[PDB]
Amino acid sequence: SNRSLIVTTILEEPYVLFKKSDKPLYGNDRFEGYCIDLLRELSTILGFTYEIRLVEDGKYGAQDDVNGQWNGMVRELIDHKADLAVAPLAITYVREKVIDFSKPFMTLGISILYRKGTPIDSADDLAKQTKIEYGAVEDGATMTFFKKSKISTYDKMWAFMSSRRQSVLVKSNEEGIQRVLTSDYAFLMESTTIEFVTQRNCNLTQIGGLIDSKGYGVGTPMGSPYRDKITIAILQLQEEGKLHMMKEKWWRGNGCPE
Numbered sequence: 337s338n339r340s341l342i343v344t345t346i347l348e349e350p351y352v353l354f355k356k357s358d359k360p361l362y363g364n365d366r367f368e369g370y371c372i373d374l375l376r377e378l379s380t381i382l383g384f385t386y387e388i389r390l391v392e393d394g395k396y397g398a399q400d401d402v403n404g405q406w407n408g409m410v411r412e413l414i415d416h417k418a419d420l421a422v423a424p425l426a427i428t429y430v431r432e433k434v435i436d437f438s439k440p441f442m443t444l445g446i447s448i449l450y451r452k453g454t455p456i457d458s459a460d461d462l463a464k465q466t467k468i469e470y471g472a473v474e475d476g477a478t479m480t481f482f483k484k485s486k487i488s489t490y491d492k493m494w495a496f497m498s499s500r501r502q503s504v505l506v507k508s509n510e511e512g513i514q515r516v517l518t519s520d521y522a523f524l525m526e527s528t529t530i531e532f533v534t535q536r537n538c539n540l541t542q543i544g545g546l547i548d549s550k551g552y553g554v555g556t557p558m559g560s561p562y563r564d565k566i567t568i569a570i571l572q573l574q575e576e577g578k579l580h581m582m583k584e585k586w587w588r589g590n591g592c593p594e
């Protein structure tokens with residue numbers, strides 16, 4: 337009996353969410369989304385069975401300053417609590433040092449989610465003031481970007497977020513959106529997710545362009561034999577246009593003027 341691979345992931349629309357149904361759903365059947373469709377394709381292409389498990393601490397993954405320990409999906413892979421991480425997991429150098437990533441299946445960049453009708457046009461507009469608050473998902477790649485950046489504007493922004501951790505860093509992208517809707521707050525979030533949000537909530541918009549550039553990749557414990565096999569599978573899916581169709585399927589946001 338070939339054991340099923342344990343796949344860690346995280347709730348994040350439209351990548352992974354609880355499928356609605358009139359009757360209860362169990363195990364893998366509970367989930368749907370872009371990353372779920374991606375996982376399904378990987379399993380058939382490589383030929384493996386799996387069991388989906390939501391990351392226990394509900395985090396993507398960041399390293400602690402004192403003990404140097406990681407958390408989130410990154411940590412679950414490091415400790416071999418999961419064979420693969422199939423989620424909107426940003427491929428970053430600091431993460432590549434502890435886990436491996438497949439080639440990216442989607443590209444993106446950090447940008448700003450805010451309301452319409454304001455003169456704000458860039459991160460610089462946010463950095464020079466403190467009336468409009470701003471933050472990012474705690475223990476995620478965006479937070480880490482600002483935490484280590486030496487770029488003047490971003491260093492200042494991290495100084496702002498750091499002293500206000502408990503009030504501006506959020507538990508999820510969903511909460512970040514809620515902050516934008518319930519206070520004078522601008523949220524630093526990935527462009528792909530901003531695209532999804534703004535096509536569904538016409539009160540919101542992206543401010544400025546992409547602050548950086550990265551991709552999402554499937555994560556595996558360092559040294560895993562599946563990493564290269566998954567990379568090939570992703571390139572195949574890309575070539576035949578399936579990744580494109582999958583994006584269109586889940587980002588279906590025929591709403592909000594642009």
Ligand SMILES: N[C@@H](CCC(=O)O)C(=O)O
Pocket residue numbers: 396397424425426472473475476477478479524525526
């Ligand atoms: N996708 C990000 C989480 C969200 C964010 O940091 O903006 C990550 O892999 O950590």
